[PDB]
């Protein structure tokens, strides 16, 4: 109708008043629909306890990097002078994204203002000056507890006699790699004349997200020699000095200490996806670990057994599920192959439910500390050895594999400690229902998918998305069409893939016209009982082409706004250009 | 047959099919010799073939992916945004998911319903100032004061930043479900709209349920946009005939 | 009080009324004789 013709129509969905059930949580009935409702409620509450215990530590680390950074910047912003006294202090914040709040100290009988500047707040030099002096007059006349001045450096000249305090303005350029440096060095030149006023103290703070050889290549050399008077650098990045990856991954183990385990493939996938992204890694760490936890409690019924009170709700289907673990198969093969007691394996094979039901609850008192010993290796490398360039994720990966000694000899600094820093752990039976893992490609398919490859796969093959049927063909309208005829927009792509770079739309139409059935669609087209217009065009002696051009032009103008087809030669639109290739 | 390509589609399929073809080997055939139709014959056979070619397999597919809905509600209520890419129209999926399923389940669980702001982003008349006008009466936030507004700044982006720092001291319940159809459409792929919709997804109290159509879509979002969205991607390609949106675009002869 | 973004100190406005002739009496049947009005 006409409601999908206007943008942003808000819609209130009306609702039935109540259904009076427990359907207030999304956790479905697992074990092919055999689970109890109280176990689903306990699973939801247990997942929320785990998720809250994780994120209450993640938030303290994330709100502690700001209390570390404000402590860092505000120490080399102050407590130092230069003998020239006609220079501005300059701090290059390397690798920093513009997300930090800066605090300026008391320093009484002197104002301290912070003038944040942006590539949107700087289209030329005069808007920078008007915004800077506007922020100066605002943060000077509102921090005092009346005339109108002009917003230029004259306010900086007579700031001493307008207010009575000395000025100390601290500039702050947010995306220094995104401003014009031609506007920025003009602003620095325009600021340089403020030196002669004896009550100012300009400080510049550059938030650079690239290296320093790309800022002093684009600036002019006189501005660079002015900036070489009192400059300091400061590396602000959460990959330098692995302290905040060794506090998010450390805190993830404090929630899963004994209840859950991590796989080998999972930690190497974490390391592969944390290394292909540098700007934000404290967020791509947490949104992989939480989505690993969310795909666990939604899938694994045995999560209800990670609390040692729910041990008595072992139904028959839990005993069916746990029995077909291959580590238990390895254990039972062990009980066969070393010695032969008959009537114990005959019990625990398929008959006795009580022995297997009480046997599994012994397997939860075990700890086998991977994450209980890895903190000892972390404390040994940080305190006793004083090496602060190690990664807890990669050390944990090698400790999980077992080649930890190679990673400890990667430094060649702890040769007398390769026995003290050694730990060879084994597997405990029934790990493979209690492990966070990725062997199905779930964290790949729904966090970092091959987007274009999935679109092209669904366009080309299309049988992995559309079903085939064997009963619903006679009550339908097209029963014999789903088996002999590919879907248009999925059939045209088979000709689009094996075409050239320049595709003539008439040849692209003829190749589509002779891959359709002729003697089927001329029978099919007369099926409709209601309308009468669709049958008279079948009484026309050129029905097949006039039904073929409709489907072809529909598929072409459907590909075009998807991105696979560029119509070159405007005012012709006859020779299209293939512009997406499969497999790339 | 009409392509002499040694390789097919990889990087060497790109390098191989980009050759140079002579003037006599070319086929300069205008599409005038295609048998012309009327507008109403197209309009008739189109709506016939939409719901009468693969109708029961597509309904079977929608019932297959319709038991996926509790995972979508779980991912929304745990903080993520959703992104539904795929072949075909994702329109009726989000009209049958967000209106029917989602907001009744959200409204019951925190105990009228939860307001659903649909946003037809395939319409090129999609300004962000009237869309943010439509957001600021479904939430009604505070106004921009004199100290918090700046010298000729953007009031929409500053208001969303003020809402972001307001909603860190609040209970975490969904207050709106923002349903964007064709998020990479011709008037919403631009930068300030995406800055708006990326700063809205920072708020936990609004669930973004987006959909894309173009294939080079993920390069609209850098390390700041793709971090404030924190999308989870779901290929729900269901081969829909996509006839709500094609009335907007040119169907010129 | 307030700090303004710019100033318009040299502004001169006329003394001109905003409500038109349609809202003098709001009675079309009782419009007085406009010719010999003072």
Q: Annotate A84-140 with DSSP letters as a single string.
A: T-SS-EEEEEET--S---------SSEEEEEEEE-SSS-SSHHHHHHHHHHHHHHHH
A322-327 — which CB contacts under 8 Å span 24+ positions?
Answer: A322/A356, A322/A360, A322/A430, A322/A433, A323/A350, A323/A356, A325/A430, A325/A432, A325/A433, A326/A432, A327/A427, A327/A429, A327/A430, A327/A431, A327/A432
- Minimal CA separation from C10 to chain A, in Å: 13
- Minimal CA separation from B3 to chain A, in Å: 6
Kindly state the tokens that stand for C34: 């406009």
- Cα–Cα distance between A188 and A176 in angstroms, integer? 13
CA distances from A363 to A313, A553, B129 (A): 16, 65, 60
What does DSSP say about strands A231-235 and A261-262: parallel, antiparallel, or unpaired? unpaired
Which of B160, B236, B99 lies closest to A449 in space, CA to CA? Answer: B236
**Can you tell me which residue has the tokens 């580590």?**
A327
Chains that touch B (3 or more CB pairs under 8 A): A, C
Judge whether B73 lies within some domain.
Answer: yes
Judge whether B133 lies within some domain.
Answer: yes
Q: Does the CB of C5 have a partner CB in chain B at under 8 Å? A: yes
- Minimal CA separation from B144 to chain C, in Å: 15
- Minimal CA separation from B231 to chain A, in Å: 7
Question: Counting Cβ atoms within 10 Å, is residue B121 exposed (0-12), middle (13-18) or buried (19+)?
Answer: buried
Beta strands in A245-299 (DSSP E): 261-262
Provide the 8-state DSSP code for B169.
S
Provide the 8-state DSSP code for B231.
E
Which of A232, A209, A243, A241 lies closest to A96 in space, CA to CA? Answer: A209
β partners of residue A93 = A207, A234
- End-to-end Cα spacing for chain C: 48
Determine the Cα angle at A27 with ends A25 and A31, to 5°: 150
CB B146 within 8 A of CB A135: no
Which of B188, B132, B121, B192 lies closest to B160 in space, CA to CA? Answer: B132
In chain C, helix, strand, coil percent, each to 5? 15, 0, 85
CB A289 within 8 A of CB A266: no
CA atoms within 13 A on the CB side of A483: 9
For A:76-95, CB contacts with C below 8 A are: none
Three-class secondary structure of residue A235 per DSSP: strand
Q: Does the CB of B12 have a partner CB in chain A at under 8 Å? A: no
For A:220-279, CB contacts with B below 8 A are: 277, 279
β partners of residue A548 = none
What is the separation of C-alpha A4 from the centre of its chain, rounded to a whole number of angstroms?
32
Which of A40, A327, A73, A403 lies closest to A206 in space, CA to CA? Answer: A73
Judge whether B46 lies within some domain.
Answer: no
CA atoms within 13 A on the CB side of A462: 22
- Cα–Cα distance between A476 and A474 in angstroms, integer? 5
In chain B, helix, strand, coil percent, each to 5? 40, 10, 50
Q: Does the CB of A494 have a partner CB in chain B at under 8 Å? A: no
Residues of chain A in contact with residue C4, where contact means CB-CB under 8 angstroms, are 148
**Can you tell me which residue has the tokens 């785990």?**
A50
Which of B56, B59, B45 lies closest to A480 in space, CA to CA? Answer: B56
How many beta carbons lie within 10 A of that of residue A292, not counting itself?
22
A400-406 — which CB contacts under 8 Å span 24+ positions?
Answer: A400/A262, A400/A264, A400/A267, A400/A370, A401/A264
Residues of chain B in contact with residue C2, where contact means CB-CB under 8 angstroms, are 146
How many beta carbons lie within 10 A of that of residue B103, not counting itself?
25
Which of B31, B237, B24 lies closest to A493 in space, CA to CA? Answer: B237
Continuous segment of H or E residues that includes residue A269: helix A264-274
- Minimal CA separation from C3 to chain A, in Å: 7
* A325 φ, ψ (degrees, to nearest 5): -90, 135
Three-class secondary structure of residue B107 per DSSP: helix
Question: Counting Cβ atoms within 10 Å, is residue A454 exposed (0-12), middle (13-18) or buried (19+)?
Answer: middle
CA distances from A374 to A249, A365, A369, A404, B175 (A): 11, 20, 8, 11, 43
Judge whether B77 lies within some domain.
Answer: yes
**Cβ partners under 8 Å of residue A242, min gap 6:** A388, A389, A390, A391, A392
Provide the 8-state DSSP code for A428.
P
CA distances from A444 to A269, A381, B86, B216 (A): 9, 33, 17, 19
Provide the 8-state DSSP code for A10.
E
**Can you tell me which residue has the tokens 């905003």?**
C18
A382-386 — which CB contacts under 8 Å span 24+ positions?
Answer: A385/A413, A385/A414, A385/A417
- Cα–Cα distance between A398 and A417 in angstroms, integer? 17
Residue of C nearest to A133 (CA): C5
Q: Does the CB of A142 have a partner CB in chain C at under 8 Å? A: yes
For B:22-51, CB contacts with A below 8 A are: 27-31, 33-35, 37, 41-42, 44-46, 48-49
Residues of chain B in contact with residue A472, where contact means CB-CB under 8 angstroms, are 56
Q: Does the CB of A307 have a partner CB in chain B at under 8 Å? A: no
Judge whether B121 lies within some domain.
Answer: yes
Judge whether B139 lies within some domain.
Answer: yes
Q: Does the CB of C2 have a partner CB in chain A at under 8 Å? A: no
Judge whether B134 lies within some domain.
Answer: yes
**Cβ partners under 8 Å of residue A527, min gap 6:** A477, B52
CB A564 within 8 A of CB B215: yes
- Cα–Cα distance between A203 and A115 in angstroms, integer? 10
Q: Does the CB of C7 have a partner CB in chain A at under 8 Å? A: yes
* Domain containing residue B158: 54-253
Three-class secondary structure of residue B224 per DSSP: coil
CB B108 within 8 A of CB A26: no
CA atoms within 13 A on the CB side of B50: 15
CB B53 within 8 A of CB A478: yes
Question: Counting Cβ atoms within 10 Å, is residue A378 exposed (0-12), middle (13-18) or buried (19+)?
Answer: middle
Give the count of domains, chain B: 1
Q: Does the beta-carbon distance from B152 to C2 stay under 8 Å?
A: no
Judge whether B7 lies within some domain.
Answer: no
Kindly state the tokens that stand for B27: 């086929």
CB A505 within 8 A of CB B31: yes
In chain A, helix, strand, coil percent, each to 5? 45, 10, 45
CB A101 within 8 A of CB A159: no
CB A13 within 8 A of CB B113: yes
């Amino acid at each position: 109708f006409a409601d999908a013709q206007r943008s942003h129509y808000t819609v209130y969905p009306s609702l039935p008043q109540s259904n009076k059930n427990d359907k207030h949580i999304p956790f479905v009935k697992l074990l092919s629909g055999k689970e109890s409702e109280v176990n689903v409620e306990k699973r939801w509450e247990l997942y929320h306890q785990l998720h809250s215990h994780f994120h209450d530590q993640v938030d303290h680390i994330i709100d502690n990097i700001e209390a570390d950074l404000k402590a860092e910047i505000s120490d080399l912003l102050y407590s130092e002078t230069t003998q020239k006294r006609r220079c501005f202090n300059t701090i290059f914040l390397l690798g920093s994204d513009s997300t930090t709040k800066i605090e300026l100290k008391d320093e009484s009988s002197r104002y301290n203002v912070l003038i944040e500047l942006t590539p949107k707040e700087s289209p030329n030099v005069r808007m920078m000056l008007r915004r800077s002096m506007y922020k100066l007059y605002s943060a000077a006349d509102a921090e005092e507890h009346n005339n109108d001045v002009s917003y230029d450096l004259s306010l900086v000249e007579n700031f001493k006699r307008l207010f009575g305090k000395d000025l100390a303005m601290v500039f702050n350029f947010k995306d220094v790699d995104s401003i014009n440096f031609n506007t920025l060095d003009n602003f620095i030149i325009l600021l340089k004349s403020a030196f002669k006023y004896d009550h100012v103290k300009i400080s510049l703070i550059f938030n650079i997200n690239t290296n320093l050889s790309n800022i002093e290549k684009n600036l002019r050399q006189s501005t660079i020699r002015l900036l070489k008077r009192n400059y300091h650098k400061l590396d602000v990045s959460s990959n330098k000095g692995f302290k905040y990856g060794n506090q998010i991954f450390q805190s993830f183990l404090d929630t899963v200490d004994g209840k859950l385990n991590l796989s080998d493939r999972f930690v190497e996938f974490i390391l592969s996806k944390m290394a292909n992204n540098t700007n934000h890694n404290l967020q791509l760490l947490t949104k992989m670990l939480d989505y690993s936890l969310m795909s666990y409690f939604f899938q694994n019924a045995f999560s209800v057994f990670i609390d040692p009170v729910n041990v008595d709700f072992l139904n028959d289907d839990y005993l069916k599920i746990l029995s077909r673990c291959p580590t238990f198969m390895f254990f039972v093969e062990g009980l066969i192959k070393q010695h032969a007691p008959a009537d114990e394996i005959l019990s625990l094979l398929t008959n006795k439910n009580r022995g297997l039901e009480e046997f599994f609850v012994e397997f939860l008192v075990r700890e086998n500390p991977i994450n209980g010993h890895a903190k000892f290796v972390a404390r040994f490398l940080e305190e006793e050895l004083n090496i602060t360039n190690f990664n807890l994720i990669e050390l944990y990966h090698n400790l999980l594999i077992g080649k930890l000694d190679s990673y400890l000899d990667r430094w060649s600094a702890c040769k007398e400690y390769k026995d003290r820093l050694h730990f060879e752990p084994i597997d405990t039976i029934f790990q493979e229902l209690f492990t966070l893992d990725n062997r199905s490609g779930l964290l790949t398919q729904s966090i970092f998918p091959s987007y274009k490859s999935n679109i092209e796969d669904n366009l080309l093959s299309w049988e992995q998305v559309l079903p085939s049927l064997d009963k619903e063909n006679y009550d339908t309208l097209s029963g014999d069409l789903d088996k002999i005829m590919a879907p248009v927009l999925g059939q045209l792509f088979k000709l689009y893939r094996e075409a050239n770079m320049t595709i003539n739309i008439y040849d692209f139409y003829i190749a589509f016209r002779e891959t359709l059935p002729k003697e089927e669609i001329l029978n099919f087209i007369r099926k409709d009982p209601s309308n009468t217009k669709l049958l008279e065009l079948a009484e026309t002696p050129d029905a097949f082409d006039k039904v073929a051009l409709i489907l072809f032009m529909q598929a072409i103008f459907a590909f075009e706004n998807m991105g696979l087809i560029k119509f070159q030669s405007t005012k012709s639109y006859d020779l299209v250009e293939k512009c997406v290739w499969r497999g790339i | 047959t009409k392509s002499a390509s040694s390789f097919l589609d990889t990087f060497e399929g790109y390098f191989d099919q980009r050759k140079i073809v002579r003037t006599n080997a070319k086929s300069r055939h205008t599409m005038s010799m295609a048998p012309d139709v009327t507008r109403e014959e197209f309009s008739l056979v189109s709506n016939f073939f939409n719901e009468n070619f693969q109708k029961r397999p597509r309904q079977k597919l929608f019932e297959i992916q319709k038991k996926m809905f509790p995972q979508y509600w779980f991912e929304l209520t745990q903080g993520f945004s959703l992104l539904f890419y795929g072949v075909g129209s994702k329109r009726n999926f989000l009209e049958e998911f967000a209106i029917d399923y989602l907001s009744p389940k959200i409204a019951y669980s925190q105990l009228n319903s939860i307001p659903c702001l649909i946003l037809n982003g395939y319409n090129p008349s999609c300004n962000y100032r009237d869309v943010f006008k439509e957001i600021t009466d479904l939430l009604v936030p505070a106004e921009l004061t004199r100290s918090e507004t700046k010298y000729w700044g953007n009031h929409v982006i500053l208001q969303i930043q003020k809402m972001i720092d307001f909603y860190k001291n609040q209970p975490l319940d969904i207050k709106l479900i923002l349903v964007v159809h064709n998020l990479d459409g011709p008037s919403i792929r631009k930068n300030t709209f995406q800055t708006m919709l990326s700063f809205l997804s920072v708020i936990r109290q609004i669930a973004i349920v987006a959909s894309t159509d173009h294939i080079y879509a993920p390069l609209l979002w850098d390390n700041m946009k793709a971090q404030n969205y924190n999308f989870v991607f779901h290929d729900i390609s269901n081969f829909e005939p996509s006839t709500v949106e094609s009335t907007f675009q040119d169907v010129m002869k | 009080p307030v700090i303004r973004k710019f100033t318009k100190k040299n502004v001169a406005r006329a003394k001109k009324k905003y409500t038109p002739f349609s809202k003098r009496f709001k009675s079309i049947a009782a419009i007085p004789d406009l010719t010999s009005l003072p």
